[PDB]
Design an enzyme around this catalytic site. Structure first.
Site, PDB file in Angstrom:
ATOM      1  N   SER A   1      13.958  -5.198 -48.849  1.00  0.00           N
ATOM      2  CA  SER A   1      12.718  -4.856 -49.536  1.00  0.00           C
ATOM      3  C   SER A   1      12.912  -5.063 -51.025  1.00  0.00           C
ATOM      4  CB  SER A   1      12.362  -3.398 -49.278  1.00  0.00           C
ATOM      5  OG  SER A   1      12.114  -3.176 -47.902  1.00  0.00           O
TER       6      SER A   1
ATOM      7  N   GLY B   1       8.411  -2.875 -53.306  1.00  0.00           N
ATOM      8  CA  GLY B   1       8.313  -3.796 -52.170  1.00  0.00           C
ATOM      9  C   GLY B   1       7.823  -3.164 -50.879  1.00  0.00           C
ATOM     10  N   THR B   2       7.683  -3.994 -49.844  1.00  0.00           N
ATOM     11  CA  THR B   2       7.192  -3.545 -48.535  1.00  0.00           C
ATOM     12  C   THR B   2       8.269  -2.760 -47.797  1.00  0.00           C
ATOM     13  OG1 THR B   2       7.844  -5.550 -47.300  1.00  0.00           O
ATOM     14  CG2 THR B   2       5.663  -5.544 -48.323  1.00  0.00           C
ATOM     15  N   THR B   3       7.859  -2.011 -46.783  1.00  0.00           N
ATOM     16  CA  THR B   3       8.779  -1.157 -46.035  1.00  0.00           C
ATOM     17  C   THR B   3       9.613  -1.997 -45.066  1.00  0.00           C
ATOM     18  OG1 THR B   3       7.048   0.564 -46.105  1.00  0.00           O
ATOM     19  CG2 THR B   3       9.002   1.013 -44.743  1.00  0.00           C
TER      20      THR B   3
END
Ligand SMILES: [Cl-]
Lengths: 235, 231, 195, 240, 243, 250, 111, 244, 241
Positions: free
Chosen positions: E74, E29-31
């Site tokens: 995330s 996932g994204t930060t």
């Protein structure tokens, strides 16, 4: 083993796709919608000559304005018919009117995907639901075990279906009379049936606005078969 | 492979294969396009027939006077989710005398889809939805995926060959967003967008399905000779 | 329902049951049979609250008939009465009890003996030579105490029953419109059509 | 509760548990049903592997559902009791609410519905039983003979057999039974039923059971000696 | 083998492989990050702009619980939403019974026990999210981070997602260079920088910065989103530092 | 968050074996030796206190448990399974008997109830069998003294004397030679200590041996006076000192 | 004891003409001898060219009208935007009312 | 989920057999032999105990022959613990019938009920079947003396003489050879013990190994008596018939 | 080989899932120790804060179950907190129902019985933790009772848990072999904590700072944990003799 409601890698439910194979093994049923009525016809397919063929009930009344023909595991259809009849009668009770053919079909199709780990497997039967209402006129629907239903001008289901559907492709036009549609169902049934077509191993029915849903007598069907033979010999 | 028997199992790379297979059913489904301006929002859907005798499967469902969606994938799952949306829209009206916000509708669909991905026995929904609506903060377009991911967008497309329509909208972004107080021109842009996803077949009178909602426009569906104008 | 009598003689049981059905102001019917055949040699008459009477009788009938098919065998009058009593005794502590009193007249084919059971709505069972429910017994028991003998014939039992019915017709305020009489013996159940 | 889907579709569109239930029926002792002009006869095989049996008290193969309808079967014996019980309860329930005994078709349809329900209910297997249901409708003199099977399909038969070597006795009945003129009397119908069982049974009269059902709740089971007279007359005519 | 096919099965190591596989979804996932400051906490997240068709500032990822707690996560976004919905029920029932708003450590264990419960049975899947959350209570500021296993600890700084190593290194410098502490307004600026620095791991697509904060002085101890001029000031500060 | 194990985990294999019961019996075989001997005027049950660490206080771990005032139990196999069975056995003695009849159950009926609980773990959904064999010694007015063995299957048998667990085969042979129908309780205790010494490796004293008796009524242990009919528990656990005294005359 | 019913007064009047219909009602709402409102609308447009009023206990009246309005909305959803005929509406209202047979809507309804 | 571990106890094989029933029958074939023999004036139940030890307290022991009511007894072959669950159910069913009809339960009705319970475990629930075969010995005033057997499938049948458990093939041949319809209880006692003596896997048949019982209508004044034989009485009847 | 996935018997009579739960116990790589004084029960445990971003005040495997009972856990923290919350709930329910504070040994038994259920019932997994309960019980005095994933439990004079438990155990065994008493003959708990720390230093062969340890002390009518400064005072006293 594996879930009953499992998706395959192509994005299809395994059980629904396997039930469709059972329906291919079923006896042929054909529906043809016209502006004078909708005709429903079935192959009876008696497993032995001692079986009293008139007890084979593959065409069924749902209400006075809605009929139904079946193909596949025909025992699975009884609870679907029951639900349809109850839905038709219940709607008349609540609203003092006939129920729309689409609304009835939609109610039957809501049962279809109620399976998992509710019933243990999908239905192994396809239905041709034919009827008439004031809003959309004469209608023919094909109700599957996927929960999907398509309206059709004409449709064949069962073992001879792709052969029959190609034949219905050529033959159907918007100006068909009821008498023409009757002969056309008998013609295509005779083509795709293993045994030779007669009044005892095939059954006709229709739904008209005036008279409602009627299963044809064997004597009436016998005359239409004799009329068909003569008109094919005529050229 | 071994980790695709059910929705409750992660793969060794952190993937949910049953969800990805449900996602695949959408790609097999017929194309549908969504797009909006500041005043109106439009759905355009290519309906699919079984054969020449059959009818064309309806793609667009009304949820309220100010909201509705188009579907791509398993139509019975769209019926279940749309019915759930109808109820939530209705609950908001009856209890709060309040039209349901389109963003909040998306949140509700996300959470409903999610429960089916984390529990045993169930399966993911096998359908993608494009929800349009006009609420107290203007026009909106949402994209629902059955993973649970809902996304607010200016325009999008889902289904087979949807990448053609999605690229067109990505170029046209600055044009169609400005089509304010002109429903016919916004529909034209949607019909031109969905044309980029066609191969062999073209848009006929019983093939095309269009819906629109806006400032002084209830959610209404156009089929048959009502869409002949836009062909 | 008003008057139900029962009398057990030498070789049979005789049940007499009134024909009137009154709903408040009017007599709606004057030919009502307040009895069900439970098995070929067991008859049950009944009286009590409207609706409950027939519902209970037919429910018992269905259960005894079900037993008969399952086992290919007729339950003894004693066994049937014990079944019926338990149903009533279960009933009395229900949300809504059956307000029904019954007489069960049967011929036990094993013992070759007539048997008469009197059970009230509480589940109070008693085997008797003669019985009645409601106000009937107030007039008729003194007659039966006087005239009854255990070795009476069926014809003597019927004459004794006429004397009971005459006394009820003389001294009771309600017009019960006569009685239907039925005899239960070794040959089964038959109705005396002239009484 | 135990919810597991035991009856499910396979890739070729077959429900194996329903088909394996038919294999249990194939293993069961042979049963045959023949309807005459004014009667129906139910014949049943009794395997002679079991001697030292007490025939007074052993469960008889033909069961009364009501006074006018009978049910015989082939397959698992324990499973048949469950269908017979449910049918008997439904027969009384119908009398109680409709004030009329069941028609043979109605009782068949009910038993068939029960069998079907067990092919798409969670946690249950199908009945390893096929039935022959025979009798006469109330105030009707037309004979009735129906057949059910594990899948839940049912149908009417002029004559039919089920169970082990039912292929052979159906072969016999298909050539010997004439629809235009069925067995006119009770004698002729019983004779044809015994004859058909004699193709498979391969022993005298202890292994054959016969039950004759006539209109107006007239049901009687034939004894050993009565059946043994039919067996004697058939083979004496055969020696020619 | 076969120990990784079912949730709640111990391998011969003593590990629950299905929980470790959920961690891979989190790492994919994204930060997202969290910074504890003097009198509060700051949350920030990387939102990947997949397409130009995404409406800016609309697809909000950070969620509020009660009025005083912020949550960011995330991994699988729906799993995070499901967890926050539960958190909101827990925070509601706590306030209903005890009157006071739920303390942050108390709230942390409510999520912790719920996530841990999804590693006890094979009929459920573990959560595919690491959740960074916190806020201001009666005992001051608290920042927490919660893993798929149900494990959680208190943090000075926290980071998860694809750019976590990059972020963690940056957070570790702030802790060393500010032992007396960081102000709320400083933390907003630093949060913007750290998300921008952590974007080198997701550098293919461009992104959208989203920040929120609870601070006793700056927000009265309530969770608020950083909007308008204060957001642009943090973006400018971040853009200046990368160049 | 569901119990989906509504199906048996113990099933018949092609050979007719119930695998899980056999495996439970294998677990019982690995367990420490315990034994029971019935005398004319009492019963003795005994086992080794196998201490898992010398820092552990083995007094706190009771392998020999009172079920009723006149019934005691000992085991071989898995200690945790035993502990929960003792809890259920004590409770069932009240719920299904004492609260109905106003007296404690006889030995055979309490045993039957324990057996029933163990049988249910052998057939119910989503459970394994109990991994213990119990030896239950007791007394009641109409049956007198009795000793029962209870296995993981739910099967139970009455014994004059027996042993279960590690060295049961050797111990049962030893008991066959020594047992007769004229034993006094002290003689049975003496035999129990002799039999148990063969299976014990290390220390052999009152601190490493647990031993109880079903014998005479103990009015001193009752705790109250003033009811002639209540004469006190027949179950008595021998002290560390009482065992060591008998080991000198060994 | 708590009395769940009240009486908000008012009067309503329906008259059917040849190709029209009227439904009239006074706008006064009362409890006991107090006026609550001089203008509280009692007769409602329910869609599909149907007008409705449920006079008596105003809380039950509002509840019923609200439920019938919603019944019209769901009739459209479930039956392809079909117009609810007045006779069908009437039968639907019977079931709404009888649904509470043992705790009635304390209202006289006219459509 | 859980599906992975499910044995599926209630399914057909491709041949149309119930796996678990067949395997339960295999289990029962290793159990100690039980014989029932019905005479004109009574029934005999004889059964062989499995666990010969000298230290087993035989006089207070019951693994084979149980009492259901005053008129009906059973002989058990299979898992004793499983049998005791069913026995207590059968005991309750008999008392329910007595409470309802004020008559003792007919033997076949009790047998059908138990057999129906066993059947249920083979068709639904996902549980293993009961690993038990019963021989029911009983009397009622309809059919008089009756012998039945039931097995894990829930099928039951009536018999003049029958064996269950180990060596039933050998036992049933010997009974079929020496049984006659006009036989009496004393003769049936002898037949039962002779059959066990030949079919036993042990070196010799002794009293400490046997459970024995008779149901006679040879009580005082035309009643029926159930006699469960004590160890000493089994020892006496072994000397009388000439086996020891 | 599904006998290794759920809690059913293997052919050897073993529950592999219980055995693998015991291995999860050492996943933290932390060693704990418990000893008893005259008036007190002291429990010490290693504290490892590997990350600088962690708030070290929130990193703890010692739990205050009730006022009188403390609990140290060897195992992963999610299972530790599962067990802690349940023990707190059980201790509170006990007091409400029976009108006196739940004894340490009774709680240990209750938690052990719960652990036993997970080894018998298939749908529940064992918790991968060893629970060491400590108190100064009002009847029994200073008390140490330990529970494990098998559902086993027992009282202890002293105990040790973790990867290097055997080294700590033998060190304690040898001290009690000398003194010939079941406890640390010392008046103040401060000196019993100093003993505990000293004998862990000797056994593990490592020196400790204030932030490397975590200490719990049970006295009559309260259990409390020491702060870093309270431990520092303890470490100063050890070094000064
Ligand atoms: Cl407990």
């Amino acid at each position: 083993d594996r879930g009953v409601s499992t998706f395959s890698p192509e994005g299809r439910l395994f059980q629904v796709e396997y039930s469709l194979e059972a329906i291919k093994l079923g006896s042929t049923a054909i529906g043809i919608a016209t502006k004078e009525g909708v005709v429903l016809g079935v192959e009876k397919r008696a497993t032995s000559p001692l079986l009293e063929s008139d007890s084979i009930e593959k065409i069924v009344e749902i209400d006075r304005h809605i009929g139904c023909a079946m193909s596949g595991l025909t025992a699975d259809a009884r609870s679907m018919i029951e639900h349809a009849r109850t839905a038709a009668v219940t709607h008349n009770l609540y609203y003092d009117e006939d129920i729309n053919v689409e609304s009835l079909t939609q109610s039957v199709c809501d049962l279809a995907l109620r399976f998992g780990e509710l019933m243990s497997r999908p239905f192994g039967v396809a239905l041709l639901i034919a009827g008439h209402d004031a809003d959309d006129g004469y209608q023919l629907f094909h109700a599957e075990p996927s929960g999907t239903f398509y309206r059709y001008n004409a449709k064949a289901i069962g073992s001879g279906s792709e052969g029959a559907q190609a034949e219905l492709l050529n033959e159907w036009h918007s100006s068909l009379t009821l008498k023409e549609a009757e002969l056309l169902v008998l013609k295509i049934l005779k083509q795709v049936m293993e045994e030779k077509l007669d009044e005892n191993n095939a059954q006709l029915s229709c739904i008209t606005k005036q008279d409602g849903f009627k299963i044809y007598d064997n004597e009436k069907t016998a005359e239409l078969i004799k009329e068909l033979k003569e008109k094919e010999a005529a050229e | 492979n071994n980790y695709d028997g059910d929705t409750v199992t992660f793969s060794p790379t952190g993937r949910l294969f049953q969800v990805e297979y449900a996602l695949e059913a959408i790609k097999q489904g017929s194309v549908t396009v969504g797009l909006r301006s500041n005043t109106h929002a439009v759905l355009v859907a290519l309906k699919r027939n079984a054969d020449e005798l059959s009818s064309y499967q309806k793609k667009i469902i009304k949820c309220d006077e100010h909201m509705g969606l188009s579907l791509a994938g398993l139509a019975p799952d769209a019926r279940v989710l749309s019915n759930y949306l109808r109820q939530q829209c209705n609950y908001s009206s009856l209890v709060f005398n309040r039209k349901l916000a389109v963003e909040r509708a998306g949140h509700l669909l996300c959470d409903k889809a999610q429960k089916n991905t984390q529990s045993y026995g169930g399966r993911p929904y096998g359908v993608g939805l494009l929800i349009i609506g006009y609420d107290k903060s203007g026009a909106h377009l949402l994209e629902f995926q059955p993973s649970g991911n809902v996304t607010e967008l200016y325009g999008t497309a889902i289904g087979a060959r949807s990448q053609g329509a999605k690229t067109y909208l990505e170029r046209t972004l600055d044009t169609f967003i400005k089509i304010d107080g002109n429903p016919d021109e916004l529909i034209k842009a949607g019909v031109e967008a969905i044309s980029q996803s066609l191969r062999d077949e073209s848009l006929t009178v019983d093939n095309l399905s269009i819906a629109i909602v806006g400032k002084d426009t209830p959610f209404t569906i156009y089929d048959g000779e009502a869409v002949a104008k836009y062909i | 329902m008003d008057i139900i009598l029962g009398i057990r003689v030498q070789d049979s049981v005789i049940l007499a049951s009134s024909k009137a059905v009154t709903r408040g102001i009017s007599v709606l019917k004057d030919s009502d049979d307040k009895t069900r055949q439970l098995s070929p040699h067991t008859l049950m008459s009944f009286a009590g609250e409207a609706g409950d009477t027939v519902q209970f009788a037919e429910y018992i009938q269905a259960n005894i008939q079900l037993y008969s098919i399952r086992e290919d065998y007729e339950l003894s009058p004693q066994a049937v009465s014990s079944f019926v009593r338990q149903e009533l005794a279960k009933s009395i502590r229900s949300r809504r009890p059956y307000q029904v009193n019954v007489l069960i007249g049967g011929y036990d084919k094993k013992k070759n003996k007539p048997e008469l059971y009197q059970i009230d709505y509480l589940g109070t069972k008693v085997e008797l030579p003669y019985g009645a429910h409601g106000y009937s017994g107030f007039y008729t028991f003194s007659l039966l105490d006087h005239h009854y003998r255990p070795d009476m014939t069926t014809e003597e039992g019927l004459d004794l029953l006429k004397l009971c019915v005459q006394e009820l017709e003389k001294r009771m305020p309600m017009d019960f419109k006569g009685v239907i009489v039925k005899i239960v013996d070794k040959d089964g159940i038959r109705q005396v059509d002239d009484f | 509760g135990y919810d597991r889907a035991l009856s499910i579709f396979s890739p070729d569109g077959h429900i194996f548990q329903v088909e394996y239930a038919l294999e249990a029926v194939k293993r069961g002792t042979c049963a045959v049903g023949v309807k005459g002009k004014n009667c129906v006869v139910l014949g049943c095989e009794r395997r002679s592997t079991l001697k030292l049996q007490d025939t007074r008290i052993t469960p008889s193969k033909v069961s009364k559902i009501d006074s006018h309808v009978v049910l015989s079967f082939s397959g698992l014996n324990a499973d048949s009791r469950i269908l017979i019980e449910k049918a008997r309860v439904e027969a009384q329930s119908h009398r109680l609410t409709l004030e009329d005994p069941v028609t043979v078709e109605y009782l068949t349809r009910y038993v068939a519905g029960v069998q079907q329900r067990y092919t798409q209910s969670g946690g249950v297997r199908p009945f390893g039983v096929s039935t022959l249901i025979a009798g006469f409708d109330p105030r009707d003199d037309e004979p009735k003979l129906y057949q059910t099977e594990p899948s839940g399909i049912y149908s009417s038969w002029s004559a039919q057999t089920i169970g082990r070597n039912s292929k052979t006795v159906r072969e016999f009945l298909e050539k010997n039974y004439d629809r235009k003129e069925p067995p006119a009397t009770v004698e002729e119908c019983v004779k044809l039923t015994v004859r058909s069982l004699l193709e498979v049974v391969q022993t005298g009269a202890k292994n054959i059971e016969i039950t004759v059902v006539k209109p107006d709740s007239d049901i009687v089971a034939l004894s050993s000696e009565e059946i043994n007279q039919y067996v004697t007359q058939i083979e004496q005519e055969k020696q020619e | 083998t076969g120990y990784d096919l079912s949730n709640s099965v111990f391998s011969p190591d003593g590990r629950n492989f299905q929980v470790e596989y959920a961690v891979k979804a989190v790492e994919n996932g994204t930060t997202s990050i969290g910074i504890k400051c003097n009198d509060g906490v700051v949350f920030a997240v990387e939102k990947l702009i997949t397409s130009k068709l995404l409406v800016p500032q609309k697809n909000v990822k950070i969620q509020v619980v009660d009025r005083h707690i912020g949550c960011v996560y995330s991994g699988l976004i729906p799993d995070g939403r499901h967890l926050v919905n539960r958190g909101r029920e827990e925070a509601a029932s706590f306030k209903k019974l005890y009157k006071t708003p739920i303390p942050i450590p108390a709230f942390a264990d409510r999520l912790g026990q719920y996530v841990q419960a999804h590693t006890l049975y094979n009929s459920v899947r573990p959560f595919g999210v690491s959740t960074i959350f916190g806020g201001v209570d009666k005992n001051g500021a608290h920042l927490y981070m919660l893993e798929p296993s149900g494990s959680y600890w208190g943090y000075k700084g926290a980071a998860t997602g694809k750019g976590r190593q990059s972020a963690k290194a940056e957070l570790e410098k702030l802790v060393d260079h500010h032992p007396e502490g960081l102000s709320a307004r400083e933390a907003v600026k630093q949060a913007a920088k750290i998300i921008y620095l952590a974007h080198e791991d997701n550098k293919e697509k461009d992104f959208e910065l989203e920040i929120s904060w609870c601070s006793l002085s700056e927000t009265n101890g309530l969770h608020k989103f950083v909007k308008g001029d204060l957001l642009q000031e943090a973006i400018d500060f971040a853009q200046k530092e990368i160049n | 968050m569901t119990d989906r194990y509504s199906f048996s985990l113990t099933t018949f294999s092609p050979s007719g074996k119930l695998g899980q019961i056999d495996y439970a019996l294998t677990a019982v075989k690995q367990g420490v030796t315990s034994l029971g001997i019935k005398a004319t005027n009492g019963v003795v049950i005994a086992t080794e206190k196998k201490s898992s660490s010398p820092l552990a206080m083995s007094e706190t771990l009771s392998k020999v448990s009172l079920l009723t005032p006149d019934i005691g139990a000992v085991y071989s196999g898995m200690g945790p399974d035993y502990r929960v069975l003792v809890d259920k056995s004590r409770k069932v003695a009240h719920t299904s008997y004492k609260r109905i009849y106003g007296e404690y159950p006889p030995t055979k009926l309490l045993v039957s109830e324990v057996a029933k609980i163990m049988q249910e773990a052998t057939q119910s959904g989503g459970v394994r069998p109990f991994g213990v064999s119990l030896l239950i010694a007791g007394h009641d007015e109409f049956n007198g003294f009795s000793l029962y063995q209870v296995d993981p299957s739910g099967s139970y048998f009455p014994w004059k004397a027996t042993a279960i667990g590690k060295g049961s085969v050797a111990a049962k042979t030893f008991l066959e030679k020594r047992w007769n129908d004229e034993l006094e309780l002290e003689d049975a205790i003496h035999i129990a200590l002799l039999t148990l010494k063969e299976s014990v490796e290390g220390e052999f004293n009152g601190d490493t041996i647990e031993l109880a008796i079903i014998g005479d009524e103990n009015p001193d242990l009752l705790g109250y006076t003033g009811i002639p009919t209540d004469k006190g528990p027949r179950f008595r656990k021998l002290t560390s000192q009482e065992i060591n005294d008998r080991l000198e005359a060994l | 004891q708590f009395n769940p019913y009240g009486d908000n007064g008012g009067t309503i009047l329906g008259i059917a003409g040849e190709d029209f219909a009227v439904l009239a009602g006074d706008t006064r709402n009362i409890t006991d001898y107090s006026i609550n409102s001089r203008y509280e609308p009692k007769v409602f447009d329910c869609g599909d060219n149907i007008v409705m009023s449920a006079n008596g206990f105003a809380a039950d009246g509002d509840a019923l009208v609200k439920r019938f309005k919603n019944s019209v909305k769901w009739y459209h959803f479930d039956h392809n935007d079909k117009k609810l005929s007045i006779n069908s509406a009437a039968r639907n209202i019977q079931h709404l009312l009888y649904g509470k047979r043992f705790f009635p809507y304390y209202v006289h309804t006219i459509i | 989920g859980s599906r992975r571990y499910d044995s599926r106890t209630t399914i057909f094989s491709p041949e149309g057999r119930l796996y678990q029933v067949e395997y339960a029958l295999e289990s029962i074939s290793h159990a100690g032999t039980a014989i029932g023999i019905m005479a004109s004036d009574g029934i005999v139940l004889a059964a062989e105990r499995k666990v010969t030890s000298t230290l087993l307290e035989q006089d207070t022991s019951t693994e084979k022959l149980y009492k259901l009511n005053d008129k009906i007894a059973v002989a058990v072959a299979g898992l004793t613990a499983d049998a005791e669950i069913l026995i207590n159910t059968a005991r309750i069913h008999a008392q329910n019938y007595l409470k309802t009809y004020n008559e003792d339960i007919p033997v076949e009705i009790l047998v059908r009920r138990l057999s129906d319970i066993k059947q249920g475990y083979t068709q639904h629930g996902g549980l293993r079947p009961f690993g038990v075969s019963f021989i029911y010995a009983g009397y009622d005033d309809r059919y008089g003396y009756q012998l039945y057997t039931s097995n894990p499938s829930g099928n039951y049948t009536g018999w003049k003489a029958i064996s269950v458990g180990a060596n039933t093939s050998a036992a049933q041949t010997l009974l079929q050879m020496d049984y006659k319809d006009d036989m009496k209880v004393d003769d049936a006692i002898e037949l039962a013990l002779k059959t066990l003596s030949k079919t036993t896997d042990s070196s010799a048949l002794t009293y400490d190994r046997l459970e024995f019982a008779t149901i006679r209508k040879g009580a005082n004044d035309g009643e029926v008596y159930q006699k469960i034989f004590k160890p000493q009485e089994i020892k006496d009847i072994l000397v009388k018939t000439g086996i020891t | 080989g599904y006998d290794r996935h759920i809690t059913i018997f293997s052919p050897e009579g073993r529950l592999y899932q219980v055995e693998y739960a015991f291995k999860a116990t050492n996943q933290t790589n932390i060693n704990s120790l418990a000893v008893r004084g005259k008036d007190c029960t002291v429990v010490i445990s290693q504290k490892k804060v590997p990350d600088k971003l962690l708030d070290p005040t929130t990193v703890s495997y010692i739990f205050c179950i009730s006022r009188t009972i403390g609990m140290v856990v060897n195992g992963p923290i999610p299972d530790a907190r599962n067990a802690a919350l349940r023990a707190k709930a059980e201790a509170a329910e006990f007091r409400y129902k029976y009108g006196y504070d739940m004894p340490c040994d009774v709680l240990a038994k209750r938690m052990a019985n719960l652990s036993q259920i997970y080894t018998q019932r298939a749908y529940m997994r064992p918790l991968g933790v060893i629970l060491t309960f400590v108190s100064v019980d009002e009847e029994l005095g200073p008390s140490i009772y330990k529970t494990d994933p098998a559902g086993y439990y027992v009282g202890y004079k002293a105990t040790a848990t973790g990867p290097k438990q055997q080294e700590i155990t033998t060190n304690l065994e040898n001290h009690f072999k000398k003194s010939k008493i079941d406890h640390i003959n010392e008046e103040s708990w401060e000196k019993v904590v100093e003993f505990a720390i000293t004998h862990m230093i000797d056994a593990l062969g490592t020196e400790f700072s204030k932030n490397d340890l975590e200490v719990g002390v049970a006295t009559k009518d309260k259990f409390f944990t020491l702060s870093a400064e309270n431990i520092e005072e303890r470490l100063v006293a050890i070094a000064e003799q």
